[PDB]
Amino acid sequence: GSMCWIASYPKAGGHWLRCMLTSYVTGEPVETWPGIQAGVPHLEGLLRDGEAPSADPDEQVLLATHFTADRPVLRFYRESTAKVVCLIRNPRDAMLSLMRMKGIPPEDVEACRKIAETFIADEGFSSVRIWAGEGSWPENIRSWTDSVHESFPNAAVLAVRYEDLRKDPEGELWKVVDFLELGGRDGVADAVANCTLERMREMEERSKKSLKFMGDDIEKAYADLLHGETDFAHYARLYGYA
Amino acid sequence: GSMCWIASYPKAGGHWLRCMLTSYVTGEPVETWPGIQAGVPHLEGLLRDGEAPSADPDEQVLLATHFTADRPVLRFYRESTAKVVCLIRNPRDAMLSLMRMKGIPPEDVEACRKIAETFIADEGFSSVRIWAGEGSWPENIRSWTDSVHESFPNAAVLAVRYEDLRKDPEGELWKVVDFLELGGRDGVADAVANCTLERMREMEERSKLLGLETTLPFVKSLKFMGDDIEKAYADLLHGETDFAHYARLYGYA
Amino acid sequence: XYXXXYX
Ligand SMILES: Nc1ncnc2c1ncn2[C@@H]1O[C@H](COP(=O)(O)O)[C@@H](OP(=O)(O)O)[C@H]1O
Numbered sequence: 401g402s403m404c405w406i407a408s409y410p411k412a413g414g415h416w417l418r419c420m421l422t423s424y425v426t427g428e429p430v431e432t433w434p435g436i437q438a439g440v441p442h443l444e445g446l447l448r449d450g451e452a453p454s455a456d457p458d459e460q461v462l463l464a465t466h467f468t469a470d471r472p473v474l475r476f477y478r479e480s481t482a483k484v485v486c487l488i489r490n491p492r493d494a495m496l497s498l499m500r501m502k503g504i505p506p507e508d509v510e511a512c513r514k515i516a517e518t519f520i521a522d523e524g525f526s527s528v529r530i531w532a533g534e535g536s537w538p539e540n541i542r543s544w545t546d547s548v549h550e551s552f553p554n555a556a557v558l559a560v561r562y563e564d565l566r567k568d569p570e571g572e573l574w575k576v577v578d579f580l581e582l583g584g585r586d587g588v589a590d591a592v593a594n595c596t597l598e599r600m601r602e603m604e605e606r607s608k609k610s611l612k613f614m615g616d617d618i619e620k621a622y623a624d625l626l627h628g629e630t631d632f633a634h635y636a637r638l639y640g641y642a
Numbered sequence: 643g644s645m646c647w648i649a650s651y652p653k654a655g656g657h658w659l660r661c662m663l664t665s666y667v668t669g670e671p672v673e674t675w676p677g678i679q680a681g682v683p684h685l686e687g688l689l690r691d692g693e694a695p696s697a698d699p700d701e702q703v704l705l706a707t708h709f710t711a712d713r714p715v716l717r718f719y720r721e722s723t724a725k726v727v728c729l730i731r732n733p734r735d736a737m738l739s740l741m742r743m744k745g746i747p748p749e750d751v752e753a754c755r756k757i758a759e760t761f762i763a764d765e766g767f768s769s770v771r772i773w774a775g776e777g778s779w780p781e782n783i784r785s786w787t788d789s790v791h792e793s794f795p796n797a798a799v800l801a802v803r804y805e806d807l808r809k810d811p812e813g814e815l816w817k818v819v820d821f822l823e824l825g826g827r828d829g830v831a832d833a834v835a836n837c838t839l840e841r842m843r844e845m846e847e848r849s850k851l852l853g854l855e856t857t858l859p860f861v862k863s864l865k866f867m868g869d870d871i872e873k874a875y876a877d878l879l880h881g882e883t884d885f886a887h888y889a890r891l892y893g894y895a
Numbered sequence: 896x897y898x899x900x901y902x
Contacts, residue, residue, distance in 0.1 A: 447690075447715060448686075448774050448775075448899075449774045449775050451714050451775075453714075454714075467692045471693070472692065472693050472694045473689060473694035532692070686898075687896050772898050773899060857898060
């Protein structure tokens with residue numbers, strides 16, 4: 401059908417993807433934070449309000465989500481889902497990302513440790529109250545890519561690393577635009593310029609490192625995971641994160 | 643058509659109706675707090691997890707929600723909805739209930755007035771960020787009762803008042819159980835005994851002691867903070883808004 | 896349950 405998903409584990413730079421996409425579809429810059437939710441709405445955001453786009457709607461519709469493709473609620477879109485964009489980033493960075501957010505100044509030993517301890521035991525953010533239904537890191541990727549057809553039988557998938565977007569914003573964005581059939585290529589330039597790190601932090605406010613530090617043991621812990629027998633190592637390898 | 647809603651506005655007594663409803667179906671008590679959520683799942687809670695009950699099942703299903711009936715997400719159950727139990731409570735007491743749930747002792751007028759005054763301006767809890775998609779008190783009521791066919795053309799409604807339930811627990815649970823055809827009636831007296839006030843507090847604590855997912859303690863009238871606020875409520879109560887219209891009708895004037 | 900905040 402006509403439904404399209406920007407799927408991603410939390411902290412994989414989904415906001416920015418959405419921002420840019422909102423800017424291309426509109427042509428105009430993003431007038432600020434809620435603009436992002438209006439453009440590529442986040443599904444969780446909508447369900448909180450009781451909002452939910454209709455299944456089989458006759459014009460193309462773009463939503464975002466951190467759910468695993470196999471969550472019962474996405475079932476209503478089982479048939480009408482055509483396209484999935486799966487945005488993926490170094491789980492090393494996602495983890496470091498939750499920290500900055502959760503507040504902590506990088507030299508708070510027992511505070512970083514614990515979250516890191518947890519992330520590694522869970523293989524993602526299962527024990528982090530901010531999100532729900534997102535599953536673990538491999539689980540999330542698996543369900544939206546290799547197993548997408550178990551949830552969305554009519555879908556096509558374009559997987560995309562956060563790091564490639566950072567290395568070539570316009571090239572990679574146009575790969576996403578092209579795949580979704582939102583038109584040109586010319587627009588793609590301005591949209592990148594309309595959602596740059598600066599315009600971003602400005603839109604957040606006028607609304608309202610690596611494993612070195614404390615590593616020795618943790619660093620090890622992580623690396624053992626990253627070269628483990630598990631689905632976490634499978635995807636790390638497969639996406640160059642190993 | 644086998645889907646059934648316990649619709650209610652926040653703080654109408656939903657957990658209790660919910661808890662007695664589970665007890666009657668299980669046949670035994672509810673030993674733990676998420677047994678309530680297991681029993682008569684609250685829609686909002688299911689969505690947080692990305693869970694959602696099947697649109698169109700073969701045998702009867704019971705959900706709870708604080709959503710207005712018209713909220714798009716419910717569009718999915720438009721034909722599968724057979725029955726609505728709309729639980730209603732005095733709005734004066736719902737407002738008081740939120741103060742108790744927020745902690746706040748009956749002395750802190752500043753603290754209580756703020757909630758009270760916000761409550762009056764909004765005709766309900768719309769500004770309280772604890773829930774979303776509920777609308778104002780009358781908005782909710784209208785959508786489940788007078789308007790229910792705009793959202794569920796096939797549905798039939800029972801209404802039940804919190805206060806009726808306190809006065810006659812077993813007689814009132816019976817109306818709800820007979821309405822939903824859950825069966826017997828000898829079961830009824832038992833379900834009430836299990837989900838008592840006392841039973842409920844202890845059942846909350848035991849869960850809470852076994853570090854469990856529970857909803858800070860969770861389990862009077864107008865004179866104390868007011869005059870300014872007394873008149874303010876009164877004016878709303880006996881005024882010409884739809885709130886008044888419903889307050890009059892369920893006998894809260 | 897399933898309730899909002901932030902407390
Ligand atoms: N077993 C029971 N019997 C009577 N009232 C109950 C009860 N369990 C909970 N309640 C009351 O229901 C109200 C909460 O409603 P909800 O569960 O829908 O939020 C609170 O009212 P008060 O705070 O006025 O006492 C709560 O104490």
